[PDB]
Short mmCIF file of N, CA and C in Angstrom, two decimals:
data_model
loop_
_atom_site.label_atom_id
_atom_site.label_comp_id
_atom_site.label_asym_id
_atom_site.label_seq_id
_atom_site.Cartn_x
_atom_site.Cartn_y
_atom_site.Cartn_z
N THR F 1 120.45 62.29 88.32
CA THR F 1 120.09 62.94 87.02
C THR F 1 119.82 61.85 85.94
N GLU F 2 119.33 62.37 84.84
CA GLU F 2 119.17 61.56 83.65
C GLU F 2 120.45 60.96 83.16
N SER F 3 120.27 60.11 82.21
CA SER F 3 121.46 59.44 81.62
C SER F 3 121.19 59.03 80.18
N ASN F 4 122.31 58.82 79.38
CA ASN F 4 122.27 58.46 77.98
C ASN F 4 122.97 57.08 77.79
N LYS F 5 123.22 56.42 78.78
CA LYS F 5 124.02 55.16 78.70
C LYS F 5 123.12 54.02 78.14
N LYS F 6 123.59 52.82 78.13
CA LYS F 6 122.77 51.59 77.82
C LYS F 6 123.24 50.47 78.46
N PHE F 7 122.36 49.80 79.33
CA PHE F 7 122.69 48.55 79.98
C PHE F 7 122.17 47.37 79.09
N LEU F 8 122.80 46.26 79.32
CA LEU F 8 122.17 44.98 78.78
C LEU F 8 121.00 44.62 79.61
N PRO F 9 120.13 43.79 79.01
CA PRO F 9 118.79 43.47 79.65
C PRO F 9 119.00 43.00 81.02
N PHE F 10 120.05 42.42 81.48
CA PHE F 10 120.26 41.70 82.84
C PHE F 10 121.00 42.50 83.75
N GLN F 11 122.06 43.37 83.24
CA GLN F 11 122.89 44.05 84.18
C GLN F 11 122.15 45.22 84.92
N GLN F 12 122.41 45.28 86.19
CA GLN F 12 121.70 46.15 87.11
C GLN F 12 122.37 47.53 87.44
N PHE F 13 123.54 47.38 87.80
CA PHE F 13 124.31 48.66 88.34
C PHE F 13 125.57 48.85 87.48
N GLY F 14 125.87 50.17 87.30
CA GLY F 14 127.07 50.59 86.55
C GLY F 14 128.15 50.85 87.62
N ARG F 15 129.32 50.27 87.46
CA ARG F 15 130.50 50.43 88.39
C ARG F 15 131.54 51.17 87.66
N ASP F 16 132.19 52.13 88.25
CA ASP F 16 133.22 52.97 87.65
C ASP F 16 134.63 52.45 88.07
N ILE F 17 135.66 53.22 87.85
CA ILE F 17 137.04 52.77 87.96
C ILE F 17 137.28 52.53 89.49
N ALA F 18 136.76 53.53 90.31
CA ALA F 18 136.94 53.47 91.67
C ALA F 18 136.07 52.43 92.44
N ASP F 19 135.42 51.50 91.66
CA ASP F 19 134.49 50.54 92.26
C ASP F 19 133.37 51.19 93.07
N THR F 20 132.84 52.29 92.67
CA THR F 20 131.78 52.99 93.19
C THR F 20 130.61 53.13 92.23
N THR F 21 129.42 52.82 92.62
CA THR F 21 128.26 52.82 91.73
C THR F 21 127.87 54.11 91.20
N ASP F 22 127.75 54.24 89.88
CA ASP F 22 127.41 55.58 89.25
C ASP F 22 126.21 55.50 88.35
N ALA F 23 125.75 54.28 87.86
CA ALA F 23 124.58 54.11 87.05
C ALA F 23 123.64 53.11 87.71
N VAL F 24 122.44 53.46 88.01
CA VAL F 24 121.52 52.54 88.66
C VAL F 24 120.28 52.35 87.80
N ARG F 25 119.74 51.19 87.92
CA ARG F 25 118.47 50.95 87.20
C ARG F 25 117.42 51.06 88.11
N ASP F 26 116.16 51.62 87.63
CA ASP F 26 114.97 51.76 88.44
C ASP F 26 114.43 50.42 88.80
N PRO F 27 114.02 50.28 90.13
CA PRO F 27 113.41 48.96 90.58
C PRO F 27 112.00 48.67 89.96
N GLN F 28 111.38 49.64 89.35
CA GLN F 28 110.06 49.50 88.86
C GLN F 28 109.79 49.96 87.42
N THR F 29 110.90 50.41 86.75
CA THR F 29 110.76 50.66 85.24
C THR F 29 112.10 50.59 84.68
N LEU F 30 112.17 50.57 83.32
CA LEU F 30 113.32 50.24 82.64
C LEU F 30 114.01 51.61 82.16
N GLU F 31 114.75 52.20 83.05
CA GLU F 31 115.42 53.45 82.77
C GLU F 31 116.74 53.47 83.67
N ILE F 32 117.76 54.20 83.25
CA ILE F 32 118.99 54.37 83.87
C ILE F 32 119.16 55.74 84.48
N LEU F 33 119.59 55.77 85.70
CA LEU F 33 119.83 57.10 86.38
C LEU F 33 121.26 57.26 86.76
N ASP F 34 121.78 58.45 86.64
CA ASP F 34 123.18 58.79 86.90
C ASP F 34 123.32 59.40 88.18
N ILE F 35 124.45 59.14 88.88
CA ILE F 35 124.80 59.62 90.18
C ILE F 35 126.05 60.50 90.03
N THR F 36 125.98 61.80 90.68
CA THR F 36 127.05 62.59 90.66
C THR F 36 126.96 63.41 91.97
N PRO F 37 128.02 63.40 92.80
CA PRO F 37 127.89 64.03 94.11
C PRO F 37 127.49 65.62 93.92
N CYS F 38 127.14 66.05 95.13
CA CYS F 38 126.67 67.50 95.22
C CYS F 38 127.89 68.42 94.69
N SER F 39 127.44 69.63 94.22
CA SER F 39 128.34 70.52 93.57
C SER F 39 129.56 70.81 94.41
N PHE F 40 130.75 70.75 93.93
CA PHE F 40 132.01 70.88 94.63
C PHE F 40 133.00 71.58 93.88
N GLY F 41 133.87 72.12 94.52
CA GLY F 41 134.94 73.04 93.88
C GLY F 41 135.82 73.70 95.02
N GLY F 42 137.13 73.81 94.79
CA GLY F 42 138.08 74.35 95.78
C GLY F 42 137.99 75.93 95.72
N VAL F 43 137.97 76.44 96.94
CA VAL F 43 137.92 77.98 97.06
C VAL F 43 139.27 78.42 97.49
N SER F 44 139.74 79.39 96.92
CA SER F 44 141.02 80.01 97.22
C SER F 44 140.93 81.52 97.60
N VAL F 45 141.56 81.96 98.64
CA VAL F 45 141.49 83.39 99.00
C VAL F 45 142.76 84.14 98.71
N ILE F 46 142.50 85.25 98.02
CA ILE F 46 143.61 86.21 97.64
C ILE F 46 143.46 87.50 98.52
N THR F 47 144.52 87.77 99.20
CA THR F 47 144.46 89.01 100.10
C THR F 47 145.76 89.62 100.34
N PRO F 48 145.92 90.93 100.39
CA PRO F 48 147.13 91.51 100.84
C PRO F 48 147.26 91.40 102.39
N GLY F 49 148.27 91.98 102.88
CA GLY F 49 148.60 91.73 104.36
C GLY F 49 147.38 92.36 105.18
N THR F 50 147.05 91.58 106.24
CA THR F 50 145.96 91.98 107.17
C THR F 50 146.29 93.28 107.85
N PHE Q 1 171.13 80.02 59.10
CA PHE Q 1 170.52 79.78 60.40
C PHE Q 1 169.03 79.91 60.32
N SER Q 2 168.45 79.41 59.18
CA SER Q 2 166.96 79.44 59.08
C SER Q 2 166.22 78.37 59.74
N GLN Q 3 167.00 77.33 60.24
CA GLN Q 3 166.34 76.13 60.80
C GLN Q 3 166.22 76.17 62.36
N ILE Q 4 166.72 77.25 62.95
CA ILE Q 4 166.50 77.41 64.38
C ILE Q 4 166.10 78.78 64.74
N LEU Q 5 165.63 79.61 63.90
CA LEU Q 5 165.07 80.88 64.20
C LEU Q 5 163.52 80.90 64.06
N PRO Q 6 162.90 81.66 64.84
CA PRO Q 6 161.49 81.66 64.76
C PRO Q 6 160.86 82.02 63.47
N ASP Q 7 159.85 81.38 63.05
CA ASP Q 7 159.10 81.71 61.73
C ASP Q 7 157.90 82.50 62.00
N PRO Q 8 157.82 83.71 61.51
CA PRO Q 8 156.69 84.53 61.70
C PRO Q 8 155.37 84.03 61.13
N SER Q 9 155.51 83.12 60.14
CA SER Q 9 154.42 82.53 59.41
C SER Q 9 153.51 81.60 60.47
N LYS Q 10 154.26 81.02 61.32
CA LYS Q 10 153.55 79.94 62.20
C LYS Q 10 152.63 80.71 63.22
N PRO Q 11 151.52 80.08 63.49
CA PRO Q 11 150.56 80.81 64.44
C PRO Q 11 151.09 81.22 65.77
N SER Q 12 152.02 80.53 66.31
CA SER Q 12 152.49 80.78 67.75
C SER Q 12 154.01 80.87 67.86
N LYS Q 13 154.67 81.18 66.79
CA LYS Q 13 156.13 81.56 66.77
C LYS Q 13 156.84 80.46 67.46
N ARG Q 14 156.80 79.26 66.83
CA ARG Q 14 157.54 78.08 67.18
C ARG Q 14 158.54 77.56 66.12
N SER Q 15 159.73 77.27 66.47
CA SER Q 15 160.69 76.84 65.48
C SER Q 15 160.33 75.52 64.91
N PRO Q 16 160.84 75.19 63.63
CA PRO Q 16 160.41 73.89 63.00
C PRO Q 16 160.80 72.74 63.79
N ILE Q 17 162.08 72.69 64.47
CA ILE Q 17 162.47 71.65 65.31
C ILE Q 17 161.62 71.49 66.44
N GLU Q 18 161.09 72.63 67.00
CA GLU Q 18 160.31 72.57 68.22
C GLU Q 18 158.98 71.81 67.87
N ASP Q 19 158.45 71.93 66.69
CA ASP Q 19 157.21 71.23 66.27
C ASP Q 19 157.40 69.79 66.36
N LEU Q 20 158.52 69.22 65.73
CA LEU Q 20 158.81 67.79 65.78
C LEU Q 20 159.03 67.40 67.24
N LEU Q 21 159.67 68.25 68.01
CA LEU Q 21 159.83 67.78 69.47
C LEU Q 21 158.57 67.70 70.26
N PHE Q 22 157.67 68.71 69.97
CA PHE Q 22 156.37 68.55 70.57
C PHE Q 22 155.52 67.33 70.25
N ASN Q 23 155.57 67.14 68.89
CA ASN Q 23 154.69 66.12 68.34
C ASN Q 23 155.24 64.74 68.61
N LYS Q 24 156.58 64.47 68.78
CA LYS Q 24 157.07 63.15 69.12
C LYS Q 24 156.70 62.75 70.48
N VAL Q 25 156.72 63.62 71.41
CA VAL Q 25 156.33 63.40 72.80
C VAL Q 25 154.87 63.35 72.90
N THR Q 26 154.19 62.35 73.59
CA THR Q 26 152.83 62.37 73.76
C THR Q 26 152.56 62.58 75.28
N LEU Q 27 151.60 63.43 75.48
CA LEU Q 27 151.12 63.72 76.84
C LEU Q 27 150.18 62.73 77.43
N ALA Q 28 149.63 62.93 78.67
CA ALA Q 28 148.64 62.09 79.18
C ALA Q 28 147.29 62.34 78.48
N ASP Q 29 146.99 63.51 77.97
CA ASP Q 29 145.86 63.81 77.27
C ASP Q 29 146.13 64.92 76.34
N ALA Q 30 145.29 65.20 75.38
CA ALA Q 30 145.34 66.24 74.37
C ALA Q 30 145.22 67.66 75.16
N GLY Q 31 144.52 67.73 76.27
CA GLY Q 31 144.44 68.99 76.96
C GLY Q 31 144.94 68.70 78.45
N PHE Q 32 145.51 69.82 78.93
CA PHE Q 32 146.01 69.72 80.26
C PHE Q 32 144.90 69.51 81.31
N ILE Q 33 143.82 70.22 81.03
CA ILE Q 33 142.73 70.33 82.10
C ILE Q 33 141.47 69.83 81.47
N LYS Q 34 140.57 69.29 82.28
CA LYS Q 34 139.21 68.84 81.84
C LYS Q 34 138.29 69.66 82.73
N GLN Q 35 137.57 70.66 82.26
CA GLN Q 35 136.76 71.52 83.06
C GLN Q 35 135.62 70.79 83.68
N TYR Q 36 134.88 71.48 84.50
CA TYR Q 36 133.70 70.87 85.19
C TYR Q 36 132.59 70.41 84.28
N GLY Q 37 132.27 71.20 83.23
CA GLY Q 37 131.26 70.86 82.32
C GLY Q 37 131.77 70.00 81.07
N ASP Q 38 133.00 69.73 80.99
CA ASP Q 38 133.53 68.97 79.93
C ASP Q 38 133.24 67.52 80.02
N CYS Q 39 133.31 66.94 81.21
CA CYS Q 39 133.00 65.54 81.46
C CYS Q 39 131.74 65.11 81.86
N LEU Q 40 130.64 65.96 81.55
CA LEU Q 40 129.30 65.67 81.90
C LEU Q 40 128.87 64.50 81.04
N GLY Q 41 129.24 64.52 79.76
CA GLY Q 41 128.88 63.49 78.87
C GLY Q 41 130.02 62.45 78.74
N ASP Q 42 129.70 61.10 78.84
CA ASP Q 42 130.63 60.01 78.86
C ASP Q 42 131.10 59.74 77.36
N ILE Q 43 131.81 60.58 76.79
CA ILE Q 43 132.49 60.36 75.54
C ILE Q 43 133.47 59.29 75.74
N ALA Q 44 133.58 58.48 74.66
CA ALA Q 44 134.69 57.36 74.73
C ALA Q 44 136.04 57.97 74.88
N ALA Q 45 136.33 59.12 74.46
CA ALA Q 45 137.70 59.70 74.56
C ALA Q 45 138.14 60.14 75.95
N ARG Q 46 137.07 60.19 76.89
CA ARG Q 46 137.34 60.55 78.27
C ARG Q 46 138.07 59.52 79.09
N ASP Q 47 139.46 59.66 79.26
CA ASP Q 47 140.30 58.75 79.96
C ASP Q 47 140.25 59.16 81.46
N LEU Q 48 141.19 58.43 82.19
CA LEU Q 48 141.25 58.74 83.68
C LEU Q 48 141.64 60.20 84.05
N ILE Q 49 141.76 61.12 83.02
CA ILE Q 49 142.08 62.49 83.35
C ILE Q 49 141.01 63.16 84.24
N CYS Q 50 139.69 62.92 84.01
CA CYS Q 50 138.70 63.56 84.86
C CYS Q 50 137.84 62.59 85.53
#
């Protein structure tokens, strides 16, 4: 997705706390792209006795 | 006994000593939860909570 961050002219990739890349620079233009995994969330089932 | 009974003037019926007790202790963050859409923007206040 899009991003609102700001890299220095030389820095290429953004690294987060877990040492996994989250901000990438385009190889052919000067823009920054954000990485976020596919939509996720825990599902819980509520039911009375079967 | 006006220093340990609830005060109806307060928004959430908390005794005056309880206010000092809550404010002295600091939590991990101002809010217990950080919802899915809360951490979309990388505000500087966003700590390791989300």
